[PDB]
Amino acid sequence: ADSTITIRGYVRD
Amino acid sequence: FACKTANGTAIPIGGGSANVYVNLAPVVNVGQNLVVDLSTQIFCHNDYPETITDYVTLQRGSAYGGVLSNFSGTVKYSGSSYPFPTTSETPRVVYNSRTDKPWPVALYLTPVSSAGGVAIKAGSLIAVLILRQTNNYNSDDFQFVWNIYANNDVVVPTGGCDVSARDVTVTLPDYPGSVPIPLTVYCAKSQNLGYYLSGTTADAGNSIFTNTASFSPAQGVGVQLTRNGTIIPANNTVSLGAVGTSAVSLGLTANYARTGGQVTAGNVQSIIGVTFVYQ
Ligand SMILES: CCCCCCCO[C@H]1O[C@H](CO)[C@@H](O)[C@H](O)[C@@H]1O
């Protein structure tokens, strides 16, 4: 790949 | 005749070799990509300019090293461009002043992709340049060998286009929510450009990317990207139209997306690959 996107997130309760 | 470098090493009269450590700022130019301009890094001088004239050439065998050796390029020596690695000694450059003057060498890379790049680790050998010095006085024939090392981690672009960032990380709000992905692209000259996404997906639509978080992964959720509200499946070329020297945004927004079953608390993570293509 020419570029790589890293998406971070959380689910809380 | 002797030479100095900016990073603090020198080769005396008679020739020899020296290590040159350079900060790399590779950029795309039209038809060729700049790797490093050494004319601000290496300087030479004549020790008897009033009576003797030194002739300086880029000797043959000058090549890229490390990973870049797999690529063909060009080299600009005092205004004219020649094939690199050099298979032939370049024409002479006259040297006649006690003041240290640049060795006008700049290494370029022939484009092979659209927006591709190659990773260079710091401390890597990136080139071996050979300076041959002679004169009009005696029969002197000396070699100055320059081992060019990368001072920093960089990506040398191998295409006619470049991205704002090779590796991006964005953080979503706590579920549910979304967030823009700041990511743009520009080209050395005008190109009809497009890109497509890569990654592991959970849906038949091939658009919802799997949660591959290592610790406490939240279940039932994945990531799905949109542009103007439209979902973007993997391996489907998104057309950007003409992209020039002005940076054009990919218009990507990351969103959460349900995979299947109960949504439980935990971390979310998805790595998505972007590849550009000419249209
Ligand atoms: C009997 C005086 C002749 C002079 C001797 C100086 C030696 O010349 C040095 O400097 C010359 C350039 O200034 C070079 O051509 C030569 O290779 C060497 O680096």
Numbering used by the authors:
A (entry chain B): 2 to 14
B (entry chain A): 1 to 279
The authors write:
The adhesin FimH at the fimbrial tip specifically binds in a catch-bond mode to terminal α-D-linked mannoses of N-linked glycans of the receptor uroplakin 1a on urinary epithelial cells. FimH is a two-domain protein, composed of an N-terminal, mannoside-binding lectin domain (FimHL) and a C-terminal pilin domain (FimHP). FimHP possesses an incomplete immunoglobulin-like fold that is completed by insertion of an N-terminal donor strand of FimG, the subsequent subunit in pilus assembly. The two-domain architecture of FimH is a prerequisite for catch-bond formation because the interactions between FimHL and FimHP determine the conformational state and ligand-binding properties of FimHL.
